[PDB]
Amino acid sequence: EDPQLLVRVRGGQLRGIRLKAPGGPVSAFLGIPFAEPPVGSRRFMPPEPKRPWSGVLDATTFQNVCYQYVDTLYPGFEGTEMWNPNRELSEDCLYLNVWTPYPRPASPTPVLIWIYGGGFYSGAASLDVYDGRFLAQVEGAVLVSMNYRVGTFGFLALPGSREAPGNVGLLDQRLALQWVQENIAAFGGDPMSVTLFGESAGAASVGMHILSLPSRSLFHRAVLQSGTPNGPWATVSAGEARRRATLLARLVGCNDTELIACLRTRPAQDLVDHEWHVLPQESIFRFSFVPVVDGDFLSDTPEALINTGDFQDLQVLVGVVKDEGSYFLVYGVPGFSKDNESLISRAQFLAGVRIGVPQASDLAAEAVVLHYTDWLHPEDPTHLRDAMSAVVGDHNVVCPVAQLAGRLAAQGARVYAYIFEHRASTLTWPLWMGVPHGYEIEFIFGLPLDPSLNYTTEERIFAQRLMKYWTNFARTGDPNDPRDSKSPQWPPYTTAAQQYVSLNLKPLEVRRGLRAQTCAFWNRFLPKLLSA
Amino acid sequence: EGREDPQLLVRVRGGQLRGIRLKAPGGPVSAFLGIPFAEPPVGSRRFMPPEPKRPWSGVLDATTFQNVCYQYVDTLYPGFEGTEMWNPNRELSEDCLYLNVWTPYPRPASPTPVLIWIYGGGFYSGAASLDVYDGRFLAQVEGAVLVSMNYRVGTFGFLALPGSREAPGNVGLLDQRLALQWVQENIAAFGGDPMSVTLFGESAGAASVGMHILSLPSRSLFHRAVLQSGTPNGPWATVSAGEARRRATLLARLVGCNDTELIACLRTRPAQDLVDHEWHVLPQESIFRFSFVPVVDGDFLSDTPEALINTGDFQDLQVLVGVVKDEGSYFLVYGVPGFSKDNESLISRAQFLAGVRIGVPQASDLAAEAVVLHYTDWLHPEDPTHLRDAMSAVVGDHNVVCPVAQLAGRLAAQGARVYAYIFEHRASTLTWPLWMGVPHGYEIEFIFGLPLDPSLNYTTEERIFAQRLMKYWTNFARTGDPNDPRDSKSPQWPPYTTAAQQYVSLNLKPLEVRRGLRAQTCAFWNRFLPKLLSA
């Protein structure tokens, strides 16, 4: 009975496991219930605080993964499997995990909270790339990550109703953060130094906590890796979500009360069968069920909220990876596969834009093609492939990030930006995909430090540097080494200068304008072009 | 005769001429200046196509430049060499249809290839008599026969009541064509090869050359063609029949005036009245607001130049085309508010948006917005220096560079030997402000070899550069290849292809080949922007 592995949280006692990390041992506390299982009549509803428990609750292992679609594009393939649920699937999945230094911090420690991604239809805290042991050991951090409801279970809404008000996935996230205010001290965490960090939909989630007042007293700083609450994919209008819910009801055989009561009767897997039949539109970033603009959690659209908000006392780290759009190309855009070099024809390129920008009218798509064509080599299949990747990356991530970072700086937030450029040596996707969406996380989390993973010694140093940026940001609001002098400094992103940095193996490099011209195209022109 | 220099007495179809032995830097040249090629287009002849000049008797004194066609004289900057150099340098008169000839001295034994110059001036101005079109250097140094003609400009040249008998339109181009005819018949008397006639022009002159390439009755009168900073396609070079008619009418109203009766009235108005009102037809704030330009008449121009360059066959055609580094700058001072020759012309963003509406007068609210998008450097959206340069760029690109880019494109695509350049040398002698860079018109003085006149104060390096360019031009005239068939050590000038889009830089350094004539931006102007005016 190791007393370092025993904690008393409000709901009672917990027994963690001692995990080993490369340079020492860490205390883990995996699968802590933070809410009553959102099951049965609770499906679609706001999460409720977990009731207290007798005895010593075992928290030595990861709990179930929230119920979700499992990816079968590339069966057995490491590139995809690594994002797939690695524990049993269950509607009962509202559990968080805590990693702390072993022995537990003598004084209150900066807490990072991870929110995973997966476009609000997938994901799990238990995935290997979010293993919080390294940041716990090396950087002496309290690292927390929670499961939240994805897909229909978490984001299916019939706006304005009692029994499916929507955004409950985001509410799960909030309850985890509430749990952290009330409990993290018991682990050595400092509740007054909480930093949220997340990727893709996790980043957008983080973003939505920035934009929702009730969340704002649960954290102090935020990191948005490769995702935003604004942009084409992160939200839906009240009207449109209601529509999507209704067509799913109809699709499985079902007054709001009545329509929901029916859905609740249905096996979880029945709902997943038709998750991907609610947007018959050949989108890429479909996912039918995403946070809804509800006039509640989201008091207005993110664009609107972002435009008007006051971000006076707020530090934020935002970035993108070199090749956001490559990964998504293989998932429905013709001519793109992991197996060949995917050198597409020009006709395919025009075809792809109609998929990548499904919102685009003929003229709009025309413009996108006009902007992204290299008119010096308009036919070269290499440029058209790389272009297609860019159209998607930029439209869905890079520009939304640029736009967000812009407004936050404008409105008094303190912003740091990066572009992530180093392709992992262990990467199992083809070369042409470059540095794909998702492939910075393994470095931030510190995975190369595990020699058993065969990461190059240079990568193991890079990871250390990134870990030190993140935890430094977490500690102080400033990614920069607070007593190491001349490494080149990471300057804050300002709308004036527009400085970001390249995160790669070469030391920091300051660049200006994050796709300045191209983001101008997406952010200022295209909107005006579609409407009128 | 008797006592006269016998090298200076020549006979042409209209009769006898006496020329003048002119001193050029490296030796003498023969000039026959102010030969009439047409019956003076005065009185009942105004607005009418030219009639060939009826033979005269005795000897015509062809020793001095003749009258310049009646045109508007610029007074934006009085005293200023920068503008005065383009102003008429002879008397203004409707009787202006004369041409000039420069030949070696003595005139050569075998027939030399002929170069015919069509001057620019937006179709509203110009003279073959300006100092920058002096043929003496080309004649002397390159052994070439150079001809330039006067052709009617403004209302006199281009006021059209399309479909009418009394004002058909395009008479200015017909003046040009008659001069080419005159060359076919008579140039051998001067030692000229009518089997080898290369047209060259600049700006509106370029456009004119272009339109000769496009007007079949003209093709049999020349063999090669050069277009310097100008094209027949693009926004300023032509007008739809309807529009041309509207303008002609509105001008008739302005001077106080059944097509017959209307023109009959116009013909009664003094030349000066017509000039005094030719600018007031478009209050329409605009730079390349020339009211009277070539009309797409379904005759001289069978159809729009845009159509013809896209559908015509150009197998048998070698073309030289280019632009200067700063086509637009010049134009900004003629009514883009903020821009002056006398200061740095640093402008605000407000003035930029303003300038884009004047520069692109035909642009909808949305399209203008698009121009601003593409031209703003969003890294420094507020930089006076950048915005100033962007505005130059907009005007230059829209009116000259992209049309030329397009022209070079469609032609090479339809089987022509196209040669492309960008001229990047600023005259040491330039009187325009530093910020204007290498402006529109300021290559001409090099092609013509002016630097060789040591009294003009050009640097030695410039003197050498001028010679280099004169070789390029005359080589092209001679062979359809600007490259020296002898010296292959020096860098080659590759044809422009749709494949590789190769052009060369003309500057004090040897030829550098570049790919892409403003490729991305000209995509904007030539491909995207049109569709943005479709709904």
Ligand SMILES: *[C@@H]1O[C@H](CO)[C@@H](O)[C@H](O)[C@H]1NC(C)=O
């Ligand atoms: C330059 O002169 C122009 C035209 O007179 C004037 O409008 C402009 O303000 C001047 N530029 C500056 C800022 O010195």
